[PDB]
């Protein structure tokens, strides 16, 4: 039955499978089960990547090497292929003939074992008819008798929902739980496997590189398991060297190479930031200030927090930064957050919390639980952060949302992870969480009933404490209150708005020049402390956009031409002069 | 397994089955045939074919008594003893039935007890190369049952014994204050290994309620690391809705998510000995508490599939923030009042009286004292030092500087978390600029001192 | 798409689990990357190791067609895998890779293409490129933890406005020929 | 005119005007005539129905795992079908 089964020992001697390091207790338990008089069938149930197939195939490698008990010295393991058995079983009884013949051969030798990988498949082996007859039923009598020994390997999910369903088959197979190895165990495993990977890639792995891969993988790569996770980084690093230049770093791969590979797999900013990134970070605050005038403290907090994470002083299991922006309307809480993403070139995960007003809406962020119509949709927040781990999470109008949503963000701020309905765990370590709240807006604009109008800035903080539970506030890195928009700052805003108009105007071929006198007139006409900088847009729209639009649609400005705006002190009104540049 | 013969043929044209070939003969009664089937298969497969079920006479078979099972092992003792060349003591066979049924629940009594005998003989036969020990002692039976059931309960090892003794001391080094909480966890865990543990309840069911910033979660998280066991951390904010509770015990059969199974039961099955940290239990729906009531007393929870998860070795620690607003509430009057009693009343309102009775102990975490905060500041500096070591930088903080940091950030209501924020602004922010662009880019050195005249810290960086 | 392609070559040259997976939103260009490699291979721009390798595309419908008889599906799937192993320089491209999880199998039977292909992917004998959307990758492909471990995810982020204009300029000769028109430079931008 | 001319906000709707006036003053009718003059769809929405907070879910639809999730949101679906239209919200104060 060479077509259906392959001898692991023969493969081990000439080619080899993998050197097995450790797992002494797991092998001893498996060997003890095989030596049992009855029901001597070990089942290596474990999580994916733990090494369920290494222990089963390692036994053959150990047997040829001779580091096994005397009873197992003559034992031979065969790897069954379910596909090969069903390759040509079109006719009735063909599969039974092949399967029965295979089991019969094992009984005659009485000194061999069968390794069925992904054993969950044989519960539903080829059965043309509806009858329960299948490989599991065929092998069930032999297992109880003890004539043959068959090793098994299946995941917890498959074993619990497929293998367990068959109570008779489960009884014969003695479950052996495989547990993920420790950090120390994994580094030793890589050292034993290092020669095999070094030869294929023609590289030499430094001791620091192997240790860093295991430690870095656990910290950033969470979905996979540690033994598989470390080998992936080590294997990928070797591949890069083969594809690197002819003689730059072929001889050895340093820790820096390992750090870069981990960053690409997890989509996290690489360690040892480049000079280009340093220039962007150094000028991040300066550039942000140009777009958003004033509110330097808010910009400093965001930039300083981002600088700490890249520097290597970031929180162990918390996001880069949690900031609650509270202030009067028009200050620029949303604008600074939006500009931060553009400056850093990272995706902006904008979530309008007004939509999630009711408690039931909380399911949208984490997905509906299993057994409901919304299971397939998943969680908007979890899916978004998974797609874009490095991003700015802008939860605008957070106060509008129900307090239930605040509870969901407790683990995000402290644990640094959120769990989806499907069970997937999101990573919030590299996301910048910014929450804009308009709490106390009514109080701050309100004028107190007294001879002296008390500043209501303090009052706003009281509503924040009432709206948000104390645990939520403690997890936050800081609450940055936007004080107000000064008159001098408003003058700059007029220039910024005119610049926005100029780019829009450039598309139509019209160039606008505004005199300094006209700019000052706009600021005084529309300056409102309570409304912030939003009225500036309205005065500019009515004063400048409305005349230009009429001329642009019908008039001299149909074809792009320069326009001049000047202030007449006698009339205290803007003077618009249009000059056609067509000819 | 007579259920199989009902089918066995569906090929085109023949339209024949084994049951149909033998159906006339059975109806005639000339031939008599014995059969065996599982209860589920008989109701679902054999019962469907009324003709076969009508003819066959059902004979119920059920697990025998404890006394009857040990007798069976004695009867089967010559066979197993001959193969392994071992001899089992009378006490050993009795221990296997009692120990296996106590810890192994999925399997029925006959095979479950015999599985220990067969494995015990193999272990005794295989363990010594010299074959010095042929007989199977009662102690060996206990060890075999432990591995099969994955229970830590066994004779305490010298290596494991030492760690247990210093569990409280090590926890105190990481978590300062809250000695009552550490004592409760350490004493309960010690009892389980000693054997003075609840027969069908978890080793510990502790509810941790305290002010914000106190180390409730940290002690639970650090306990897992000190004991070298997995941490089954289940955030309970996600389970606010009633329908979400099914996720913990699995969706009912026939739905899209039935296959994935329960998240709590599967995790407990994968890690029998682990710390189950149910943080923010207050936020969870009342239905969640109902499930836990069964776990605390019965000791097992059945999922949609029907498998039972063993919580006997699981350390159940549920952190709660109930009555935390009262803790930070400032009472009217010249002198602030202790609102600890008010917080307990809120916990009593949220948690049913029956729930509290089941809990082993309710530990009210006290506010961090000034002395405790000084230790907290040092702990955070150690974490910063470790991060700096990765970049090749060494940080030395003077004693005067540490006291200054403690006073600036010490708030009784807020807790230890403000200390981290102070360290971030005062220490991490300057280092970050130097690390990215400055003397600390490579192989830096740092010194920190408090300017007594200016009452401001001084940061000295050496390129080195 | 040099950075995206460069990572794919690194994954393909791995000793084990050398199966790159292209996960991105619809319209990003995952198929272009999988097929673009073949186009670059003919030109020779790809590295020397990639040179002389043939990339094939698997039609799931064709493989499952006329497989009612027991074992017909396994015969076709095991025949193709044998071909890839024998060549040693062929890379399979399975578009909409989530489909193999639900390939030809009986109602009770759990044997699928994913289970059959799982042993070969781990050993590294065959290289299999993949392409699937984020929704399908998480709701279907990731559920099969065993299969996901063998496949290495390669995140694809849609190109910027500046990057997109050059893509149109490179694809402009084909669209112009089909529509017999010329696109102005300003029109493309 | 400003939006069509290319001098629009580029991130906000064409206009957000609150017409507050006495009954029978023409606030509702001017909007209806605007749609006819422009030949665009009129997304009439009576806000008197949304007297309480729970009714707001209808505008954006029910979340996953709750009844009526398949139905979707009337306001979101209406705007999607007719991008260029006049979104009238009568009796906004009563909402």
């Amino acid at each position: 039955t060479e077509n259906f089964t392959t001898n692991l020992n023969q493969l081990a001697r000439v080619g080899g499978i993998d050197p097995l390091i450790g797992r002494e207790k797991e092998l001893e338990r498996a060997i003890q089960v095989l030596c049992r008089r009855r029901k001597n069938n070990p089942l290596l149930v474990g999580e994916s990547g733990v090494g369920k197939t290494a222990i089963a195939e390692g036994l053959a490698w150990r047997i040829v090497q001779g580091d096994v008990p005397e009873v197992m010295a003559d034992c031979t393991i065969y790897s069954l292929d379910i596909g090969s058995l069903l390759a040509g079983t079109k006719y009735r009884g063909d599969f039974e003939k092949r399967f029965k013949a295979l089991l019969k051969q094992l009984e005659q030798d009485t000194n061999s074992i069968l390794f069925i990988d992904e054993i969950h498949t044989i519960i539903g082996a080829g059965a043309a008819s509806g009858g329960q007859v299948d490989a599991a039923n065929l092998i069930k009598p032999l297992l109880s008798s003890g004539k043959i020994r068959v090793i098994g390997s299946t995941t917890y999910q498959e074993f619990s929902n497929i293998f367990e369903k068959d109570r008779a088959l489960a009884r014969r197979f003695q479950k052996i739980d495989i547990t993920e190895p420790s950090i120390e165990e994994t580094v030793q495993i890589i050292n034993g496997l290092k020669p095999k990977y070094e030869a294929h890639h023609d590289v030499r792995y430094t001791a620091k590189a192997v240790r860093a891969a295991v430690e870095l993988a656990v910290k950033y790569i969470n979905d996979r398991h540690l033994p598989d996770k470390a080998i992936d980084v080590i294997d990928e690093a070797g591949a890069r060297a083969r594809l690197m230049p002819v003689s730059k770093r072929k001889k050895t791969v340093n820790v820096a190479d390992i750090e870069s590979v981990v960053a690409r797999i997890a989509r996290i900013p690489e360690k040892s930031v480049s000079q280009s990134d340093r220039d962007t970070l150094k000028n991040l605050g300066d550039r942000l200030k140009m777009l958003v005038f004033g509110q330097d403290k808010a910009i400093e907090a965001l930039t300083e927090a981002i600088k700490m994470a890249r520097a290597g002083l970031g929180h162990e299991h918390k996001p880069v930064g949690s900031f609650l922006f509270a202030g009067p309307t028009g200050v620029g809480k949303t604008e600074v957050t939006v500009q931060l993403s553009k400056a850093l070139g990272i995706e902006l995960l904008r979530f309008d919390m007004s939509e999630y007003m009711e408690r039931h809406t909380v399911s949208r962020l984490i997905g509906a639980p299993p057994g409901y119509v919304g299971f397939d949709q998943g969680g908007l927040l979890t899916d978004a952060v998974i797609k874009h781990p490095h991003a700015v999470l802008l939860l605008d109008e957070i106060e509008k949302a129900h307090p239930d949503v605040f509870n969901i963000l407790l683990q995000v701020m402290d644990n640094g992870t959120l769990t989806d309905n499907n069970g997937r765990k999101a990573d919030f370590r590299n996301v910048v969480l910014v929450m804009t709240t308009n709490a106390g807006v009514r109080e701050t604009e309100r004028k107190s009933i007294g001879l002296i109008h008390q500043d209501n800035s303090t009052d706003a903080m009281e509503e924040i404490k009432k709206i948000f539970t104390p645990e939520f506030r403690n997890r936050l890195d800081n609450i940055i209150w936007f004080d107000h928009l000064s008159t001098d700052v408003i003058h700059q805003v007029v220039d910024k708005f005119i610049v926005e108009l100029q780019v829009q105007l450039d598309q139509k071929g019209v160039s606008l020049e505004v005199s300094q006198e006209a700019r000052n007139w706009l600021a005084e006409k529309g300056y409102d402390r309570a409304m912030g900088a939003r009225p500036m847009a309205r005065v500019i729209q009515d004063n400048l956009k409305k005349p230009l639009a009429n001329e642009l649609l019908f008039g001299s400005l149909v074809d792009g031409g320069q326009v001049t705006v000047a202030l007449d002190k006698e009339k205290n009104e803007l003077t618009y002069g249009f000059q056609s540049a067509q000819k | 397994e007579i259920h199989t013969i009902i089918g066995a043929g569906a090929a085109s044209g023949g339209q024949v089955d084994a049951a149909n070939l033998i159906k006339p003969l059975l109806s005639s009664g000339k031939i008599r045939v014995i059969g065996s089937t599982t209860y589920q298969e008989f109701s679902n497969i054999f019962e469907k074919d009324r003709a076969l079920a009508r003819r066959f006479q059902k004979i119920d078979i059920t697990e025998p008594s404890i006394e009857e099972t040990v007798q069976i092992i004695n009867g089967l003792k010559p066979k197993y003893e001959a193969h392994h060349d071992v001899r089992y003591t009378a006490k050993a066979v009795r221990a296997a039935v009692e120990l296996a049924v106590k810890y192994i629940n999925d399997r029925h009594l006959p095979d479950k007890a015999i599985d220990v005998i067969d494995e015990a003989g193999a272990r005794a036969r295989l363990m010594p190369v010299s074959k010095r020990k042929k007989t199977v002692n009662v102690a060996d039976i206990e060890s075999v049952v432990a591995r099969i059931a994955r229970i830590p309960e066994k004779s305490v090892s010298q290596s494991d014994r030492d760690t247990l003794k210093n569990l409280g001391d090590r926890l105190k080094m990481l978590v300062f204050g809250q000695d009552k909480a550490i004592e409760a966890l350490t004493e309960a865990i010690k009892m389980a290994r000693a054997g003075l543990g609840h027969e069908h309840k978890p080793v510990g069911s502790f509810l941790f309620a305290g002010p914000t910033g106190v180390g409730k979660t940290e002690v639970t998280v650090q306990l897992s690391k000190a004991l070298g066991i997995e941490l089954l951390r289940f955030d309970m904010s996600e389970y606010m809705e009633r329908h979400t509770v099914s996720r913990l015990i699995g969706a009912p059969p026939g739905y899209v998510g039935f296959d994935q199974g329960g998240l709590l039961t599967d995790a407990v099955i994968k890690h029998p000995h682990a710390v189950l940290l149910l943080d923010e239990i207050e936020k969870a729906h009342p239905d969640v508490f109902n499930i836990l009531l069964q776990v605390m007393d019965n000791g097992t929870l059945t999922d949609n599939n029907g498998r039972k998860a063993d919580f006997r070795n699981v350390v159940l620690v549920m952190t709660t923030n109930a009555g935390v607003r009262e803790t930070e509430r400032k009472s009217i009057g010249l002198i602030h009042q202790d609102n600890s009693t008010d917080a307990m009343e809120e916990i009593k309102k949220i948690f049913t009286p029956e729930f509290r009775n089941r809990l082993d102990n309710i530990i009210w975490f006290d506010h961090l004292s000034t002395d405790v905060i000084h230790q907290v500041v040092d702990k955070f500096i150690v974490e910063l030092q470790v991060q700096l070591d990765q970049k090749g930088v060494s940080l030395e903080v003077s004693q005067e500087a540490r006291n200054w940091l403690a006073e600036k950030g010490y708030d009784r209501a807020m807790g230890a978390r403000p200390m981290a924020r102070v360290i971030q602004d005062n220490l991490k922010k300057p280092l970050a600029n130097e690390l990215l662009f400055g003397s600390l880019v490579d192989g830096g050195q740092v010194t920190v001192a408090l300017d007594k005249e200016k009452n401001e810290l001084t940061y000295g960086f050496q390129s080195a | 798409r040099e950075k995206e392609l460069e990572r794919a070559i690194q994954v393909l040259c791995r000793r084990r689990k050398n199966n790159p997976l292209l996960v991105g939103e619809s319209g990003v260009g995952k198929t272009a990357i999988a097929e673009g490699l073949a186009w670059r291979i003919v030109q020779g721009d790809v590295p020397e190791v990639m040179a002389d390798c043939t990339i094939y595309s698997l039609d799931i419908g064709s493989l499952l067609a006329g497989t009612k008889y027991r074992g017909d599906f396994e015969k076709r799937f095991k025949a193709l895998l044998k071909q890839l192993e024998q060549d040693t320089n062929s890379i399979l491209f399975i578009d909409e890779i989530h489909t193999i999880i639900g390939a030809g199998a009986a109602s009770g039977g759990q044997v699928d293409a994913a289970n059959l292909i799982k042993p070969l992917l781990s050993s590294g004998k065959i290289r299999v490129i993949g392409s699937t959307t984020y929704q399908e990758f998480s709701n279907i492909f990731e559920k099969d933890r065993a299969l996901a471990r063998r496949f290495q995810k390669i995140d694809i982020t849609e190109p910027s406005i500046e990057e997109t204009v050059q893509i149109i300029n490179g694809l402009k000769p084909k669209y112009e020929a089909h529509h017999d028109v010329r696109y102005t430079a300003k029109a493309v931008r | 005119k400003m939006a069509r001319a290319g001098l629009g906000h580029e991130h906000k709707p064409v206009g957000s005007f609150l017409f507050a006036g006495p009954t029978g003053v023409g606030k509702t009718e001017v909007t209806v005539q605007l749609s006819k003059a422009l030949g665009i769809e009129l997304l009439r929405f009576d806000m008197s129905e949304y007297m309480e907070r729970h009714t707001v879910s209808r505008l954006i639809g029910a979340p996953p795992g709750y009844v009526g999730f398949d139905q979707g949101g009337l306001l979101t679906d209406a705007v999607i079908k007719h991008p260029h239209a006049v979104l009238l919200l009568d009796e906004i104060e009563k909402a």
Binding site: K90, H360, V373 | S12, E241, H243 | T67, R70, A106, G108 | -
Partner: peptide, 18 residues
């Protein structure tokens, strides 16, 4: 008062005539 809304092919064998 919210409400939650909860929400054939087999291979065959052929026998040739004897």
């Amino acid at each position: 008062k919210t409400n939650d809304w909860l929400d054939e092919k087999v291979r065959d064998a052929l026998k040739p005539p004897s």
